[PDB]
Design goal:
This is part of a larger assembly, with four copies of chain A. Chain A is of the alpha+beta class. Helix content of chain A is 28%, strand content 27%. In chain A, strands 1, 4, 5, 8, 9, 12, 13, 14, 15 and 16 form a ten-stranded mixed beta sheet that branches. In chain A, strands 10-11-17 form a three-stranded antiparallel beta sheet, with no helix packed on it. In chain A, helix 2 (49-72) runs parallel beside helix 6. The two termini of chain A are 41 Å apart. Chains A and B meet through strand 1, helix 5, helix 8, helix 9 and strand 14 of A and helix 2, strand 3, helix 3, strand 4 and helix 4 of B. Chain A: Its main location: virion. Chain A: Homotrimer; disulfide-linked F1-F2. Interacts with the Glycoprotein G; this interaction involves both head and stalk regions of glygoprotein G. In pre-fusion state, found as a dimer of trimer. Chain A: Disulfide bonds join 45-159, 298-307, 322-330, 354-359, 361-384.
């Protein structure tokens, strides 16, 4: 649907074509993250930092339990049946999170039945059996640190130093927590919170959590980097200082009739000046409908882009006409950086601005000249096979489009400036012009 | 040039003038990073975590080698006589590539000649068991190896190989490797779609060595006096030139460039100051930093660049175009300058330039010291220049300052200028203004 | 593309086919030659010859440094990351320069970056008292000093410093230095109008070291198995990059290229054989060596090239054009080939290609051993092909030869060709002929 | 880039066209020309091949 031939006139050359995939169909796993480390092996010289740590952790955790109890006390069976009068303010995401919370409360009761076992764990990853058929893992936030460094060093150094090191390590852990579990956690019910952020309750080591949970998919890395693996807090205990998390493991579902087209910008020559076109690098096409994408939130691979939400955003109608052949509506920016790309390779066919970079292919042994009317030059085996641009000697393929490419001209768009201060003044000047 | 006098009355008080310099002429040094520790001394109960770490690592390094081999299987030396020296590129087999990708490809082949020598040392590279090791590829050429978690294992795991049940040692080693992989996945994971590129900073590369780039750069050498500069501006970059899936180690070519001052170019910083107009406070909306090069004025996207006391440093020519209206606003035509009403009570209201201070004498208490009488600002003067002509010591709130001569017009405070139109700079305000003007046009 | 059958019938029998290679991709090594010897151990009664030699050497070396300074003063590093950031040329201060001269100028500046470091070693270079010395340039780099007259002094004058009158040692010395200068003037004298260029062979440079280039190249290293080649073809060249008039020592950058065989490019040699026609002997005038590359036929000025057994080696692409008529002659239009009547009795009359024998049996007596009878050439056959079909063993005077089978036409000896016009190739014959045609035209 | 057409044999590069030229690895600053101002806009006849 895109006119790539006319887009190469404006410096937009064809890049990779990728398949668009979205998170869907999430499974569930239940884990126990214990933020209080078992310190029964170091009780001889643990001092009084433990009570201060407990008070600080209670102060941190209590608002979480408060914002969970609004849904705990307002949900009962009457499927899941909600009480909106005592909720007051909630979004669609919040209500779905609450229904998920009550669905997970059934297994939360069974995990809470093992409170004594949970509070007695003294290893980083401990296996507990919540039912005869299903099991649960327990992760202690700082148990590896204690058992590896602080337990062996209980007698070689005076235990005042041990106490200070304990306090500093717990304070560093709290420092790492507070970016995520502190007052920034305004809405704990929501499940949009990434596993990477949840692992800050375990030292940022989400690899251990996921590997112990036993991932069994070939999309695991794309799931992890695209923030697809999400979690939700369903119970917080202020007596044993532990939270249980439902980790969601989804599957990457490729969207039918959907692909993502990448365009590589090439500086082109116009009116004895060098310009660059202002068109988005990536385009979402779904059932012959063209729309943008905030690909910064997504993860780009060699053949696909993985997103944990549907990120299609609207496109201006004029932009849509620009990408479908009407190149006169594609905005262009004057070039000020001496380090803007000037040549690009698509399908083995080389598009370049020979006015700005000298082109002289080797097989003819002569220079390739660009006139004052041509924005970019196509080189292929038809003109001369192997081209040289500065330090590179490149062997080329054959073009598939028109054979008279270099002889046909086109129309060009208007100049624009993309800086935020530039945008305000163009609005101001246009407003003044209207007046 | 810039008209500081007309800018000052709008509130754009003159600031520090900084030179502009960009990386150039990069030197090349080669190193290897072994993404796997040598667990030889702890192998007695290393368990099975080594094998699983091998598979997980391989799952990350395989795409990198796959992307590199798109070039390796498509790169060779030509006759060199049919045409001036260069490297041949099998472009029909490459398909999709940018200028930067092809440039990295050329550098990749060029480094391959040294990489063959380093690979001749594969057994020595695998045998490394120190966090930093020095090796010879020939008697007139050293190379360095930086292991993954060798030092950490060497310092805490090996000494505690008996004092605790070493099954706990297996657990701790598993946690350490997982922590490394989690730290690595931000850079070397699926985000690394283009290993054929030299735009990756040494800070990102050091994540394969625990984020410890200072050891990389100290061991390689502080060749220049601007070293901190090249470091902070993301100027020191590196490229992966060899990936090994059996010893689990990469070869990286680190670039140490030199900062070239762009001649006849400087960066001017403008300070905003709130000023009066129509019984309200306003702050002008102009770029804080302007790049003037060869008597041509243009913006600079200075977010990536590093600002020091004396010069502005960028790892790329980050100059960007500037509107014609901003040009005229910056060279005298203050009626085209934007201004924004200030609602916040935490906007700066006075600034000091060249020993003279431009102040907003009504919005802040404004009195003088040497006479004890207050300094009054009328409703028609946007800002009051206070210099030692009016009195040599002024008081603003709780600060008492001594002021020097002025260099411009002597009758500055008695001359007014025209004022531009208001603007609003919120993200949603732009859409609202566009809609209103579109509806007005219709 | 060459049709060998008509060429053979005219008298141009097949010869060896050799590949075409050219010097390419030159590596560099830097050395210094001290053109003055250290006479410290024998300075007790050297006399005043040292000072006079000093003045003479200054007089010879001054123009070299004067020509070098034209580039030294006018070479500078252009500023900023816009261009490759290399060297700028004060072209208006240079005035007159060629492409090769400018190229050498660039290589001269490039080498300055190392020459400054070597000139830091000035005191060490003065202190050298052996004909070859190795010095550390850096912890990863080295440089060699060659003394022009150290071997002679250390082997003859120092041992014989007392067994003969000292005055006699004075003369001997004077004579030795004068001999050095006489050998030197051919290369480093006023003949060296352009010291900047790098087209000067290592053999010529070694004249400053007594003509012993094999020591220069052995001490630097036999980098490849083609060494004798880059040596004879004048492919190994050097450049003078710094001349010092106080210590009288020059720095030379020696270039060690690699021989790139040109693809689709071979050199063909044709053997001339005298052939009978019109009751007289004639020899065709065609190039002995012909260069056919990319199906294109061109001559080669092989006098400056080296013709080994398997390849033709040149320090420069010495391909030259060829007349259209010569191309048609070598293609098959055999009537366009010139021929020269032979009056010498020492012209070869037979040749052997692929084991088949071409001979002029009219001029030389041929008989076959197997049948014990003469081999007869008629008056209208230019040459006689003899092979195993004719008879497996023929003789030509005092040689018994055994012949293989022919690969071309079976009826070779029964088919005739057309013959071209006579020519005369004396230097005065060209002037005589040109007058005749000019008079004929008038 | 400085472009040469198929009609003209060589180019006079001087400060008039621009004051510094690049020809591969050389960067050369140039001086004034003393002959005709319109050097590059006029063609001449050419001799026979030999």
């Amino acid at each position: 649907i895109l006119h790539y031939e006319k887009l190469s006139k404006i410096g937009l050359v064809k890049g990779v074509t990728r398949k668009y995939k979205i998170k869907s169909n999430p499974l569930t796993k239940d884990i126990v993250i214990k933020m209080i480390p078992n310190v029964s092996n170091m009780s001889q010289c643990t001092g009084s930092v433990m009570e201060n740590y407990k008070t600080r952790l209670n102060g941190i955790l209590t608002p979480i339990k408060g914002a969970l109890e609004i849904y705990k006390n307002n949900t009962h069976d009457c499927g899941v049946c909600m009480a909106g009068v005592a909720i007051g303010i909630a979004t669609a995401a919040q209500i779905t999170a609450g229904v998920a919370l009550y669905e997970a409360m059934k297994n939360a009761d069974n995990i809470n039945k093992l409170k004594s076992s949970i509070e007695s764990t003294n290893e980083a990853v401990v296996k507990l059996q919540e039912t005869a058929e299903k099991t649960v893992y327990v992760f202690t936030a700082l148990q590896d640190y204690i058992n590896t460094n602080l337990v062996p060093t209980i007698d070689k150094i005076p235990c005042k130093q041990t106490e200070l090191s304990l306090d500093l390590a717990l304070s560093k852990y709290l420092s790492d927590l507070l970016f995520v579990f502190g007052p920034n956690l305004q809405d704990p019910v929501s499940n949009s919170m990434t596993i990477q952020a949840i692992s800050q309750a375990f030292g940022g080591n989400y690899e251990t959590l996921l590997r112990t949970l036993g991932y069994a998919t070939e999309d695991f890395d794309d799931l992890l980097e695209s923030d697809s693996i999400t979690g939700q807090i369903i119970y917080v205990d202020l007596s044993s200082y532990y939270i249980i998390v439902r980790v969601y493991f989804p599957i990457l579902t490729e969207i039918q009739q959907a692909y993502i087209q990448e365009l590589l910008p090439v500086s082109f020559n116009n009116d004895n000046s060098e310009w660059i076109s202002i068109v988005p690098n990536f385009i979402l096409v779904r059932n012959t409908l063209i729309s943008n994408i905030e690909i910064g939130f997504c993860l780009i691979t060699k053949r696909s882009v993985i997103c944990n939400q549907d990120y299609a955003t609207p496109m201006t109608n004029n932009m849509r006409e620009c990408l479908t052949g009407s190149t006169e509506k594609c905005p262009r920016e004057l070039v000020v950086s001496s380090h803007v790309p000037r040549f690009a390779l698509s399908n083995g066919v080389l598009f370049a601005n020979c006015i700005s970079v000298t082109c002289q292919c080797q097989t003819t042994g002569r220079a390739i000249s660009q006139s004052g009317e041509q924005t970019l030059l196509m080189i292929d085996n038809t003109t001369c096979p192997t081209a040289v641009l500065g330090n590179v000697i490149i062997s080329l393929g054959k073009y598939l489009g028109s054979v008279n490419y270099n002889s046909e001209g086109i129309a060009i768009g208007p100049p624009v400036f993309t800086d935020k201060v530039d945008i305000s003044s163009q609005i101001s000047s246009m407003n003044q012009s209207l007046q």
